[PDB]
């Protein structure tokens, strides 16, 4: 499965001037485009090397698209004040996220579209993609405004057709990058504590996509230290799980790695 | 491509 997601953000700036609009495009676990109004150069720019050579029609469309969204979001911000009874003193956030997910077959599986005020669920497009549901008592006016103007129909066409159509295009554009699977480099490192305590770590480094599984056995559930999947900085990801080991008896514990890049799930132990 | 339209709240 592959998905085309977009993360749009607008932040009101009291005294600093016009609000700041920033939108980022994601083909799978890869950021491929971005837009920013803070620059004097306010255009949609390539953030993946496969987008670097695309032509100016595409860059013209996406700039005018993002430009228009920024204009509306600016107004939406002054409007959102009236609802929550706010002043020109506080800096507030307006976030919009949308995306389509393909199936294991190759065609549309699901789609989503959510709006949020100050990082809190505001208005959400229904699962059916036919209408809107307010997740806040102040969104009620914005909802029974959208539902009456058949707004969900515009978003339905993009999510079901456009989003999907273009996603295939981008996946083909960078087959050698996106569709190529990088399996994780795995190693177990030992960091002792005292006479009894000791720490054993399972390092999963250089993997794509970020969806991975790392667990310690004897099924050892009680107090496992696991870190969030962090970006390596080169496009791949990193993750590790640590366990409290009673000194000497190390072979009693086993680490299991599960990722799409591996044909069979790999198990590991520390080499002294 | 990002959505061509948006919501006027």
């Amino acid at each position: 499965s592959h998905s085309l997601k977009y993360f749009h953000t607008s932040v009101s700036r009291p005294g600093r001037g016009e609000p700041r609009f920033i939108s980022v495009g994601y083909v799978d676990d890869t950021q491929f485009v971005r837009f920013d109004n803070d620059a004097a150069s306010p255009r949609m720019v390539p953030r993946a090397p496969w987008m670097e050579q695309e032509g100016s029609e595409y860059w013209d469309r996406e700039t005018r698209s993002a430009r228009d969204t920024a204009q509306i979001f600016r107004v939406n911000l002054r409007t959102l004040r009236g609802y929550y009874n706010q002043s020109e003193a506080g800096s507030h956030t307006l976030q919009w996220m949308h995306g389509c997910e393909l199936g294991p077959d190759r065609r549309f599986l699901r789609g989503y579209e959510q709006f949020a005020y100050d990082g809190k669920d505001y208005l959400t497009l229904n699962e059916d993609l036919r209408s809107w549901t307010a997740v806040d008592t102040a969104a009620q006016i914005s909802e029974q405004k959208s539902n009456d103007a058949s707004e969900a129909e515009h978003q339905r066409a993009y999510l079901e057709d456009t989003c999907v159509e273009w996603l295939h295009k981008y996946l083909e554009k960078g087959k050698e990058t996106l569709l190529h699977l990088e399996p994780p480099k795995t190693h177990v490192t030992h960091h002792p504590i005292s006479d009894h305590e000791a720490t054993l770590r399972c390092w999963a480094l250089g993997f794509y996509p970020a969806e991975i599984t790392l667990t310690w056995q004897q099924g050892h559930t009680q107090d496992t230290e696991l870190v969030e999947t962090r970006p390596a900085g080169d496009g791949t990801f990193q993750k590790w799980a640590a366990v409290v080991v009673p000194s000497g008896e190390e072979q009693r514990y086993t680490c299991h790695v599960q990722h799409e890049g591996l044909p069979e799930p790999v198990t590991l132990r520390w080499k002294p | 491509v990002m959505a061509p339209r948006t919501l006027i709240l």
Partner: T-cell receptor, first 115, second 111 residues
């Protein structure tokens, strides 16, 4: 709510003109249309909350702008004999209103370009 | 791009008139205007949903399940209806505040 200035205007070939718009109170968008004598209304330019939103095949000699208050102006240079038309002003985009997309027109400016 | 046929209708008072509007793309909102010589276009009916038919007395407009057609009917035709009828629409997938117009249909009501 939409009010246009002037009503009837008459100049000569090669000169310049300025046309005013006072949109509805609360409406952020302004549109400019060129309805010829029978040749249907053709879109020129649209502004939204001060900035230019959409353009529609303007001759380059035709200028325009929207101010901090939602007022607008349409500037016409090297006025040519062919430009003799009924220029209309439209207003919409009041996030206060529920009918938003709905457009409202003002009684157009009758412009004539003689030699 | 929108197209209104038949461009002109020479009719007799008391009769009923139908007006068609066909587009070259799927639409989401339909707007019906009337323009009197010199006067600015004034809104008659606005359609938002695919199946709905909406009215203002003698005037009735339809959306059309096709999403590329809209109709305008005038019940009793007093010679007051003499005017140009413009059809407008919100093309599906278009950005906010983008709406197309037609050349309009001229209605002539004979006494």
């Amino acid at each position: 709510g939409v009010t246009q200035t002037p009503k009837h205007l008459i100049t000569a070939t090669g000169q310049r003109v300025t046309l005013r718009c006072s949109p509805r109170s609360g409406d952020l968008s302004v549109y400019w249309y060129q309805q010829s004598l029978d040749q249907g209304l053709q879109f020129l330019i649209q502004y939204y909350n001060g900035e230019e939103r959409a353009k529609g095949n303007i001759l380059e000699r035709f200028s325009a702008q929207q101010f901090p208050d939602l007022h607008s102006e349409l500037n016409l240079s090297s006025l040519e004999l062919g430009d003799s038309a009924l220029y209309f002003c439209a207003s919409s985009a009041n996030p206060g209103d529920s009918s938003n997309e709905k457009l409202f027109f003002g009684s157009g400016t009758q412009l004539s370009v003689l030699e | 791009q929108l197209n209104q046929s038949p461009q002109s209708m020479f009719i007799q008072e008391g009769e009923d008139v139908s007006m068609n509007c066909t587009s070259s793309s799927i639409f989401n909102t339909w707007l019906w205007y009337k323009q009197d010589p010199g006067e600015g276009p004034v809104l008659l009916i606005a359609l938002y949903k695919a199946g709905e038919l909406t009215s203002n007395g003698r005037l009735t407009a339809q959306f059309g399940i096709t999403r590329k057609d809209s109709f305008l009917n005038i019940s009793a035709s007093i010679p007051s209806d003499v005017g140009i009828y413009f059809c407008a629409g919100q093309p599906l997938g278009g950005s906010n505040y983008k709406l197309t117009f037609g050349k309009g249909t001229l209605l002539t009501v004979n006494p």
